[PDB]
């Protein structure tokens, strides 16, 4: 039914169109921290606790 059958007299027939979509993506932030007191590193059994 929808075949572009074009005759011999031509004319404005069989016109088409075009589209386009778009994608997306965002950026988030992460992070964490830990705490220590100097004594807990100076007076300690293990040398390289850090």
């Amino acid at each position: 039914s929808k075949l572009p059958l074009l005759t011999e007299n031509g004319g404005r027939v069989n016109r088409v169109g075009f589209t386009r979509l778009s994608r997306e993506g965002s950026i988030h932030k992460f992070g964490f921290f830990y705490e220590f007191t100097q004594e807990s590193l100076d007076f300690d059994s293990d040398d390289q606790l850090k």
């Binding site: 830990y34 705490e35 220590f36 007191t37 004594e39 807990s40 007076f43 300690d44 059994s45 606790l49």
Partner: protein, 51 residues
């Protein structure tokens, strides 16, 4: 803040959790405090007679 607390008196250090504790908690000076011989009179005033 993980603090050293006091392992000697019983309080476990913060990083030492569950069944653990500090494993070098003092210092051995390794220099014993010994006493010398008591002063000895009587003994050096003595002649000997061999048997």
């Amino acid at each position: 803040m993980l603090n050293y607390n006091a392992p000697i008196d019983g309080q476990k250090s913060s990083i030492d959790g569950a069944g653990s504790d500090q494993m070098n908690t003092f210092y051995w000076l390794k220099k014993a405090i010994i006493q010398a011989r008591k002063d000895q009179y009587f003994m050096p005033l003595a002649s000997v007679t061999n048997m």
